C-alpha cells in the first residue's frame, strides 16, 4: 500500500516503526513474498538508514529483518540491498546490537555472502570475520546455528577461492563446533571444514594442526548421512596431500571407518569412499599394506564388478594404484589376484571410457609382469596370471583395444599382446 510508504518517510518515530513492521510482515508471508513490489516503492535505502547507530533498537531489528528477506531473492534483488550500502551497517550491528539484532544481521550477511563469490569476498573484505568469531562466545544455540551457516557460505567457493589469510582464522572455532549436539550446526560446520580442505598443502596442514582429522573420522560413523557426506568429503580431501599428511589420517583409524561406508545405501557415498581409498593406495608401500590389512580389497572387488559406473570407476583406481606397489612387494599382486580382481578388471574394458581403459591396462600389465617374474623363479612353464586373463576373456578385449583411436591405448595393447600372448 502507498499509505505505508508515506508513513515510512514520516518524521514521526512511531509512524516509522509501524511501517517497518508492516513492511517486514509482508516479506515474511508463507507464500510468494512481493519483493519486487517493495523494491519498486523505493524504500530500501530508507530501511538502510534505520540500522544506524543512533536509531532505536526495535527499528533496527525490524528494518534488518525486512532487508534480510529482500536479500533472499535473486542476485538482482540482492544487489539492490548491497548497492544501498547495507553491508557495512549489518557488520556494526554484530558488535553493538542485542542478541535478537545480531541474529538478524548475521542472517542477512548469510544471504549476501551466499549470492556470489564477489559478495562472499566483499563481506570478507569489510572485515566481518572479527565480530563473527565473537558471536560464538555466546550460549544461545539459535544464534550460533545461523552464524555457523553464514560461516559456511564465506568458506565456500573454489573458483575464485576465498582469502586464505582470513578464512583460515575460523579453524579453531570450527574445531569445537564439530562436537555440537545440534545437528543443523554440526552439519554446516563439517561442510565448512571441507571447503577449507579443498586447497593446497598449506590448507591441508592447517586442518591437520588444529587436530580436526581424528574427530572428523569419528563422525563418519554418525547415523545421519547429512553428517557423513561433508565429513567424508573433507577426509577425502586430506589424503590428497603427501604421504605424511595421509599417515595422520590412517593413524586416526579412517580405514576401518571406510570399510563400513562401502556398504552405505547412498550411492555417492560408496563412490567417494572408493575415491578416498584410492588416494591412500597412491601412497607408499606400507600404506598400501595398511589398506590390505584393513580388509578393504574384497569389498572393493565386489563393487568393481557390480556397482554403478561412477563407482566402479573409483574402485578401479584404488585397485590399480595398489598394483603399483607390486614392483616392491610381489605379494601385494599375489594377494590382489588371489582375491579375484582379474575377471572384474577384464570385463571393465568392455564398457569403460578411454581414461579408465588406461588405468585398467596398467593394472592388468603390472599383474602380468609379476606372474612372469614368477615363471622364472619358481621355474614355471606358463605365466599363471596370463592364463587367468585368457579365461576371463580378457585377452580378446585387450586385443580389441588395438583399434582404439587413442595412441596411449592401442600402443599399450599391442605391447601387452606381443609380450605376453604370442
Amino acid at each position: 500500500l502507498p499509505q505505508m510508504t508515506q508513513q515510512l518517510n514520516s518524521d514521526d518515530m512511531q509512524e516509522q516503526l509501524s511501517a517497518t513492521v508492516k513492511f517486514r510482515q509482508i516479506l515474511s508471508r508463507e507464500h510468494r513474498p512481493p519483493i519486487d513490489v517493495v523494491i519498486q516503492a523505493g524504500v530500501v535505502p530508507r530501511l538502510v538508514e534505520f540500522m544506524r547507530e543512533n536509531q532505536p533498537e526495535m527499528l533496527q531489528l525490524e528494518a534488518a529483518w525486512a532487508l534480510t528477506n529482500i536479500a533472499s531473492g535473486t542476485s538482482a534483488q540482492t544487489k539492490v540491498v548491497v548497492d544501498a550500502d547495507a553491508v557495512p551497517l549489518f557488520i556494526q550491528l554484530l558488535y553493538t546490537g542485542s542478541v535478537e539484532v545480531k541474529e538478524q544481521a548475521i542472517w542477512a550477511l548469510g544471504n549476501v555472502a551466499g549470492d556470489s563469490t564477489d559478495y562472499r569476498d566483499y563481506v570478507l573484505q569489510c572485515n566481518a570475520m572479527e565480530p563473527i568469531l565473537g558471536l560464538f562466545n555466546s550460549n544461545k544455540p539459535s544464534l550460533i546455528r545461523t552464524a555457523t551457516w553464514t560461516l559456511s557460505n564465506l568458506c565456500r567457493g573454489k573458483k575464485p577461492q576465498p582469502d586464505w589469510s582470513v578464512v583460515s582464522q575460523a579453524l579453531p572455532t570450527l574445531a569445537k563446533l564439530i562436537y555440537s549436539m545440534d545437528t543443523e550446526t554440526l552439519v554446516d560446520a563439517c561442510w565448512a571444514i571441507s571447503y577449507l580442505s579443498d586447497g593446497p598443502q598449506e590448507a591441508i596442514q592447517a586442518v591437520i594442526d588444529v587436530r580436526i582429522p581424528k574427530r572428523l573420522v569419528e563422525l563418519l560413523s554418525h547415523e545421519s548421512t547429512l553428517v557423513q557426506t561433508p565429513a567424508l568429503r573433507a577426509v577425502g580431501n586430506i589424503v590428497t596431500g603427501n604421504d605424511l599428511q595421509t599417515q595422520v589420517v590412517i593413524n586416526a583409524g579412517v580405514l576401518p571407518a571406510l570399510r563400513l561406508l562401502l556398504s552405505s545405501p547412498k550411492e555417492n557415498i560408496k563412490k567417494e569412499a572408493c575415491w578416498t581409498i584410492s588416494n591412500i593406495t597412491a601412497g607408499n608401500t606400507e600404506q598400501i599394506q595398511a589398506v590390505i590389512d584393513a580388509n578393504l580389497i574384497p569389498p572393493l572387488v565386489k563393487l568393481l564388478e557390480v556397482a554403478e559406473y561412477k563407482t566402479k570407476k573409483e574402485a578401479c583406481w584404488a585397485i590399480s594404484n595398489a598394483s603399483s606397489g607390486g614392483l616392491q612387494r610381489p605379494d601385494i599382486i599375489r594377494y590382489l589376484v588371489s582375491q579375484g580382481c582379474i575377471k572384474p578388471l577384464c570385463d571393465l574394458l568392455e564398457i569403460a571410457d578411454n581414461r579408465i581403459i588406461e588405468v585398467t591396462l596398467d593394472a592388468l600389465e603390472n599383474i602380468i609382469k609379476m606372474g612372469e617374474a614368477d615363471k622364472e623363479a619358481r621355474g614355471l612353464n606358463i605365466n599363471e596370471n596370463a592364463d587367468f586373463i585368457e579365461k576371463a576373456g580378457g585377452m580378446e578385449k585387450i586385443f580389441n583395444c588395438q583399434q582404439n583411436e587413442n595412441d596411449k591405448i592401442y600402443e599399450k595393447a599391442y605391447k601387452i599382446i606381443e609380450t605376453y600372448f604370442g
Binding site: 580431501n237 590428497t240 575415491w275 597412491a282
Partner: peptide, 5 residues
Amino acid sequence: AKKAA
C-alpha cells in the same frame, strides 16, 4: 597418482 576434486 593422487587425484584431486
